Amino acid sequence: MVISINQVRQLYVAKALKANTAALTTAGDIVPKADTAKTTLYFQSMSPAGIVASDKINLKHVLYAKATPSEALAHKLVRYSVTLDADVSATPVAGQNYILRLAFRQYIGLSEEDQYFKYGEVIARSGMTASDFYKKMAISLAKNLENKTESTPLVNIYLISAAAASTDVPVTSATKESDLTATDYNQIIIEETEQPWVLGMMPQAFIPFTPQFLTITVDGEDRLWGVATVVTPTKTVPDGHLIADLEYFCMGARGDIYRGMGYPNIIKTTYLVDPGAVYDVLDIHYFYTGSNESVQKSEKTITLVAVDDGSHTAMNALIGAINTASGLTIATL
Amino acid sequence: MVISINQVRQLYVAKALKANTAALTTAGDIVPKADTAKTTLYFQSMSPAGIVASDKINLKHVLYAKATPSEALAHKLVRYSVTLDADVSATPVAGQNYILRLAFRQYIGLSEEDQYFKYGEVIARSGMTASDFYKKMAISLAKNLENKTESTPLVNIYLISAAAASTDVPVTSATKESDLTATDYNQIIIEETEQPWVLGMMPQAFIPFTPQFLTITVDGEDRLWGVATVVTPTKTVPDGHLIADLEYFCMGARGDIYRGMGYPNIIKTTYLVDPGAVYDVLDIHYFYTGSNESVQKSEKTITLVAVDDGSHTAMNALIGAINTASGLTIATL
């Protein structure tokens, strides 16, 4: 995952916070060092091959410093609630074919011009109610979408029982309608899924979607049979696949830019981000100006990531160690 | 002396801290002047031809302001102790010629490639005491050194008796063995010497050396007969000659730069530093920035020298008058 830079950006994983240079013993330790005059801030840390210090931040030449929680960096998956249009008919009219076109927009390619469509179809019956429609619609959608031998999963299908109204009933291709026994179904939730991820090589990306409806002949009138509204999101993609890509890039500004290229003839870098753990990010953005005529700024930033467990314990202690050393006023998340 | 500049260096001599203007009547007086809003700072000082005000320091643009205690600018004359070590022999071997070579560097030229060697030799006898060897080695050094009819020698050779242990007997080319009457001389002191100095033309320099020994053979093996240990220095060169050379260079950034070139047709610059008094120094380093395109900095520095009474009362009064008027907090020494 290549990112943009204002100028060079360095990341330091804060796996443990110490109070001296001498206490740095394990890979992932950190200590914010400063003066007693508070004119220079740097971060001594323990690399996987020894102690390494960061750049020296002039505390007069800081632009901003802000700390971002984990839930700010968690992607909310988009949900769409597919119902029958009550103006058209609240019950399925008999003998009509109910086809639904899910329009994917950023399928495999990177643009909106690379598009993809998955269909679901139900021909309504004489005694088919609304819940028996949503049952057969979601069985037909999951049969087309969530086959096992697809290339990537696209969306998740969930019925909702009107008695429950807050618990998602998962519908897959292996699901039969013998398993779906509830008689009060009021919507079909279609919700996007998390794509695969390889660190550095495949970034975190999502394929957005919209459900679209073909018209039915209701009373001699070609009316589109349903409406699709976007309900509030109830799931989040965690921060871990985003920070490990943020470390894989920012370990070439310190380390090797040739990552893997002539394969046995490489330096291999040890990365201290566990991709299955959430992190909080602190961005100290600062600059350098020269003596007399070298007044152009070299605006750069030093990133710090700390793993946090619910309440942000390790980041608020990191900020509290920076604020007493630097004299800064970084706000605590 | 020629020193480097950060585009300028201005020097003003402080002789009496007057409280305001129209109290400056004698040459050397100074008042630190600033406005009520503490935006600009300057010094109105009585030059030997009238009141002169310094360049105005924008107090938003002060890079550093720090003062020097005048003990940190005094050079220590290095002492070396020459002794017969107990490992080879603590008594002079009866047949061996003991030669002590003094290896100078930065002799007349300016490099360590200009080396000068002076010698001192004693051939020992059967009944020679280790105390009588140090009397003869110091005199044999004081004949090869201290032979200059022109000037003071490159080193001064002293003798400590073990009964005294803190008062050094001086050994000159006039000194014979009848004058040294003690029986317990235990070491030889080879001390540095202050070189000549003339104002503005000959800078203050020193000639470093190393007492080196030639091999004698005692237990069949050629062993170095002595040990040269650097004693902590007991003699200093005061801060007079460096400040007088500092005022000489930095009064050409304000006055005449032709300091005696076409010799009858010259402008005489009256200097206020006498070279026989110690001086505390106070450096204030500021810059200038212009508007809308001229964002380049014109860094400057203003030097203030004040005579030392040992308890630093003249500089601490000058610092405390600045901190009241300017609002900066310069650390009192």
Cβ distance B63 to B289 under 8 Å?
no
**How many residues would you count in chain B?**
333
> Which residue in chain A is spatially nearest to B331 when comparing CA positions?
A37
Q: Which residues of A fall within a CB distance of 8 Å from B296?
A: 292-293, 295
Q: Give dist(CA B22, CA B31) in Å, integer.
A: 10
Please tell me the distance from the alpha carbon of residue B323 to that of residue B321, in angstroms, as a whole number. 6
Tell which A residues from 83 to 142 touch B, by Cβ distance under 8 Å: none
Contacts of A182 (CB under 8 A, 6+ apart): A131, A159, A161, A163, A169
Contact B295 A293 (CB under 8 A): no
- What is the rounded CA–CA span in Å between residue A153 and residue A143? 12
A295 → closest Cβ in B6, B7, B295: B295
Lookup: tokens for A126 = 């004489």
Provide the token pair at A290.
């020269």
- Single-letter amino acid, residue A232: T
- CA triple A235-A237-A240, angle to 5 deg: 150
Residue A73 per-residue DSSP state:
G
Contacting residues of A for B297, CB less than 8 Å apart? 291-293, 295
Residue A219 touches partner B, C-beta closer than 8 Å: no
In angstroms, how far is CA A168 from the centroid of its own chain?
A: 21
Q: Are B238 and B278 in contact (CB under 8 A)?
A: yes
Q: What is the DSSP string of A243-306?
A: HHHHHHHHTTTTT-S--SSSTTSS--PPP---TTS-EEEEEEEE----SSS------EEEEEEE
Task: Collapse the DSSP code of B247 into the 3-class scheme (helix H, G, I; strand E, B; otherwise coil) and give the result.
Answer: helix
Contact (Cβ atoms closer than 8 angstroms) between residue B120 and residue B100: yes
In this structure, are residues B233 and B91 in contact, taking their beta carbons and an 8 Å threshold?
A: no
* Phi, psi torsion values for B134, nearest 5 degrees: -70, -25
Query: Which SS3 state, helix, strand or coil, does residue B133 take?
Result: helix
CA-based torsion, B237, B238, B240, B246: positive or negative: positive
B102 strand-pairing partners = B118, B211
Whole-angstrom distance, CA of residue B25 vs CA of residue A78: 84
Q: Which helix (H) or strand (E) is A242 found in, with range?
A: helix A240-250
Question: Hey, of B8, B294, B296, which one would you mutate to test binding to chain A, going by the most A CBs within 10 A of its CB?
Answer: B296
Helix (H, G, I), strand (E, B) or coil at B129: coil
Question: Cβ separation of A295 and B297 shorter than 8 Å?
Answer: yes
What distances in angstroms separate CA B183 from CA B138, B288, B321, one per listed residue? Answer: 14, 69, 59
Q: How far apart are CA B66 and CA B333, in angstroms?
A: 10
Helix (H) or strand (E) holding B40: strand B40-47
B7 in contact with chain A, both atoms CB, cutoff 8 A = yes
Residue A6: what are its φ and ψ, rounded to 5°? -80, -45
Q: Is A36 on the interface with B (CB under 8 A)?
A: no
Residue at token pair 């508007």: B291
CA B147 – CA B175 distance, rounded (Å): 12
CB A144 within 8 A of CB A155: no
**CA B44 to chain centroid:** 31
Residue B142: strand, helix, or coil: helix
For the record, the structure tokens of B2 come out as: 């020629």
Side by side, the strands of the sheet bearing B62-68 are B10-14, B300-307, B279-286, B62-68
- Interface probe, candidates B297, B301, B329, B330, chain A, greatest A C-beta count within 10 A: B297
Mutate to test the interface with B, among A38, A292, A294 (most CBs of B within 10 A): A292
Q: What 3-state DSSP class applies to A83?
A: strand
Resolution (angstroms) equals 3.3
Written as six digits, the tokens of B41 are: 């700072």
Give the CA angle between residues B303, B304, B308 to the nearest 5°: 135
Q: List alpha helices for chain B, DSSP H.
A: 130-144, 240-250, 313-326
Q: Which residues contact B129 (CB under 8 A, 6 or more apart)?
A: B91, B183
Rounded-to-integer distance, Cα B251 and Cα B300, Å: 15
Half-sphere exposure of A7 (CA within 13 A, CB side): 9
* Residue A310 neighbours by CB under 8 Å, 6+ apart: none
Do residues A283 and A66 touch, judged by C-beta distance below 8 A? yes
* A181 close to B (CB below 8 A): no
Sheet strand arrangement including A62-68: A9-14, A300-307, A279-286, A62-68
Q: Which residues of A touch B64 (CB under 8 A)?
A: none
